[PDB]
Amino acid sequence: MSKGAELFTGIVPILIELNGDVNGHKFSVSGEGEGDATYGKLTLKFICTTGKLPVPWPTLVTTLVQCFSRYPDHMKQHDFFKSAMPEGYIQERTIFFEDDGNYKSRAEVKFEGDTLVNRIELTGTDFKEDGNILGNKMEYNYNAHNVYIMTDKAKNGIKVNFKIRHNIEDGSVQLADHYQQNTPIGDGPVLLPDNHYLSTQSALSKDPNEKRDHMIYFEFVTAAAI
Amino acid sequence: MSKGAELFTGIVPILIELNGDVNGHKFSVSGEGEGDATYGKLTLKFICTTGKLPVPWPTLVTTLVQCFSRYPDHMKQHDFFKSAMPEGYIQERTIFFEDDGNYKSRAEVKFEGDTLVNRIELTGTDFKEDGNILGNKMEYNYNAHNVYIMTDKAKNGIKVNFKIRHNIEDGSVQLADHYQQNTPIGDGPVLLPDNHYLSTQSALSKDPNEKRDHMIYFEFVTAAAI
């Protein structure tokens, strides 16, 4: 295992901050909640702090803390994410939406005191104004995905890839192809994993009494061998 | 005393009991947990009480209480499921697994004391020995689905249809085509809805310390207009 993994044996408070700019539409999101890595469970509430969110909430789910994955005991040697803590890691992505534009993101994920914090900058470009993102044609829901992880030795980190399936209001499915890299912030040794994946499942909900534009988010994640 | 949707304003205990026979393999499942219709959420723990389950857990998710859906204020007059309570409803299904066998089920959903009980009989047939079901090739996860509901006036009830997408270990998807009808057990007034759907999202998990064959199940459901 790792020293960093010891920070996740209980329930850890989470703070998330995102600034986004998609086809020139600027927005910010704040989130808070808690993670339980022993069972691979996360619960988060997000608010669009700038007013109305100009893209669908489902497009932001992957951008908005994989250190909360459950790694079974026999796989603990493969948990890069916790091993990088508390100093943290940089998480970078490019996301290609099928027949549409792309997102690029850079985040820093680290502890500040007792809290695990994820601070993100996101840019989206080349979206179609009548596509499913800017045209807001994505259903308010989420599916199950496998997140594939391998070591990137030259970078002392990992490369990650997966394809998200977004349900569209006409019954179709639009893919979002994710390419991700994570690099440690600190100088300490990290765990560089064998190839494996994270089984991820999620649900998007609302608080009927919350008048702000918001997302209540539930996630369940467990690592598995290939 | 309390009737209809009045029975669902708080947290309600749930009991699920299923007796199944699939390609001649007999088994039973018991589930317990709680539902919160105000937010459209439920949580259940299922155990195979006869030992090892002879089919994948994902195949049984839909069979194993749509009265826990959140109906928004503008749709309260369309909630058949709660309107039938406490006396309850019969739920019957036929389910076809693409290029494989079928399930047929009959359930009674009603209050027994303060518990909402779903008691089910299920028969499966025509499965392939090396198909995804009997060959155990279904991933342990679940996706988001729309459940379409209309009135069935002749039966004083509803007709329901949907298709489940089951993720398969090779990266394919196997569809399960569902045909469902619900009719009240009692003779009191019920709500016969306009056409609408339920947006359903779920996640399947495990308790690492539970040795029995089991499923921890989370569901989130909200009704929406068409």
What order do the helices and strands come in, and which of them pair?
2 copies of one chain form a homodimer.
Chain A: E1 12-22, E2 25-36, E3 41-48, H1 80-83, E4 89-97, E5 102-112, E6 115-125, E7 145-152, E8 157-167, E9 173-184, E10 196-205, E11 214-225
Parallel strand pairs in A: 1-6
Antiparallel strand pairs in A: 1-2, 2-3, 3-11, 4-5, 4-9, 5-6, 7-8, 7-10, 8-9, 10-11
Whole-angstrom Rg of chain A: 17 Å
Which assembly state applies to the chains in this document?
homodimer
For the biggest sheet of chain A, the summary is: 11 strands, mixed, barrel
**CATH fold assignment of chain A:** Green Fluorescent Protein
Order of helices and strands of chain A: EEEHEEEEEEEE
**What structural class results from the helix and strand content of chain A?**
mainly beta
Greatest interface by residues involved:
A-B, 28 and 28 residues
Number of domains of chain A: 1
Q: Tell me the name of the CATH class of chain A.
A: Mainly Beta
Helix content of chain A: under 10%
Q: How many distinct helices of chain A? A: 1
Pfam families (chains A, B): GFP
Family (chains A, B): Belongs to the GFP family.
Protein name (chains A, B): Green fluorescent protein
InterPro entries (chains A, B): GFP (IPR009017), GFP-related (IPR011584), Green_fluorescent_prot (IPR000786)
